[PDB]
Point group: D2
Chain length 115, copies 4
Amino acid sequence: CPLMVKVLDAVRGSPAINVAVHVFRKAADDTWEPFASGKTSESGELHGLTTEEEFVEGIYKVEIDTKSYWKALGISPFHEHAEVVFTANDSGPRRYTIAALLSPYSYSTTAVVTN
Amino acid sequence: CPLMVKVLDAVRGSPAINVAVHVFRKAADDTWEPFASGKTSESGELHGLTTEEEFVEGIYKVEIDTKSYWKALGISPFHEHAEVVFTANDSGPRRYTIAALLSPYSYSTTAVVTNP
Amino acid sequence: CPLMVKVLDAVRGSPAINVAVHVFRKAADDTWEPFASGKTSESGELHGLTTEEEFVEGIYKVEIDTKSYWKALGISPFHEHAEVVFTANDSGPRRYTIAALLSPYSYSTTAVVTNP
Amino acid sequence: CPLMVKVLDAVRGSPAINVAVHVFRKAADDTWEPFASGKTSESGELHGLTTEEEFVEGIYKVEIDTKSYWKALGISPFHEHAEVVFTANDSGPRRYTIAALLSPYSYSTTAVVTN
Ligand SMILES: O=c1cc(-c2ccc(O)c(O)c2)oc2cc(Cl)cc(O)c12
Ligand SMILES: O=c1cc(-c2ccc(O)c(O)c2)oc2cc(Cl)cc(O)c12
Ligand code: NA
Ligand code: NA
């Protein structure tokens, strides 16, 4: 599993469950092309987005649909979504976890990249 | 000042100085049209991007060029940039401060929104 | 102003107003002696805690009373308080801004340290 | 496992490995009494701190020794340590994860409390 996404809710102190996540890969024409997507699980995680074969070097965007999450909880939010944009780099073996910690008017994102 | 951007460096405990910032507004055809740009000052702040007249309702994107900032400090960071996307002024004019706290493999961002 | 505290509310996107803050300094006997206290203003800021003369070298603790803040907004939060512990002025006087960004089950804190 | 601690490094994009963590429980005399401790693993985690039997309601402090972590990496830090103080509350079955994301001049902590 070369790419995993984990989303946490700082208001409820819980995983952020059933959050839509869309991954895009930058194309040669510099547009964003759909790459993978899903909804976070009961543990706030989304696994199985891609494979080592498909996840080649390039620029990727992970879009987390935070606004719909806050709306569905009856809470007013600031952002349309959280976007995480990064270059995948081969530099020996690699696994990427994109984590996000959500509040209505703030989010934090970190990358945990391990071998 | 209806839109201000403040950027801090969590490695040095300092304002993040000379960080490029580009603001876009979603157009009627769903494209991101350039709206304003600038660079943070020695206080980590960017003022004067727009005016209450210009800053109409819409969906805005604030792109903060974090990668260039880190590379200049000798660090190869994770993110290309930090992007903040939000609807503004849809209940009338507000003042927005977009703050970002930067680390090489993480950032946070928060909005402070006040009613003048 | 050598020590300032700024507190923001990540639920409302606003300054965190009326938050109690207590500052302590570690004494020669390793106890935490009260040093200064106050409450954040309508801008979320607390100024005037100390002076360059009073704010000598030492280990300081800034306790921010986040639990009371949230309970007053109807929220039962996780943390009792947010505590920020740091050595100050050990290379001469500096100006410290201690910032905190609050959510019911999370907080962050960062320091901005400048040399006057 | 009613209490777990997870520590991440925002400078290296990695778990924070071999970080000392001390847990205290507030005593009747309002002093902090040592409760459990350990060092984070290669995954930045510390498991096995306590048991359901021992982890009764009360006020707890988790102290993460961030200064020694940054010093050992050759990096100058701001804080002496990060402290997380909370009340454990029985309210049906519960598991507490105390997570921290570390930078030299900033840290973020969140609680993930699940059943
Ligand atoms: O404290 C945190 C904890 C975690 C976290 C990340 C992955 C996990 O499996 C987990 O249990 C917790 O991610 C964060 C991610 C961010 Cl961006 C900020 C944080 O403070 C945290
Ligand atoms: O601690 C912080 C402090 C500030 C901050 C500091 C000074 C300001 O005038 C302001 O508007 C914001 O912004 C943050 C912004 C974020 Cl996203 C996270 C933080 O921890 C902070
Ligand atoms: Na409207
Ligand atoms: Na000294």
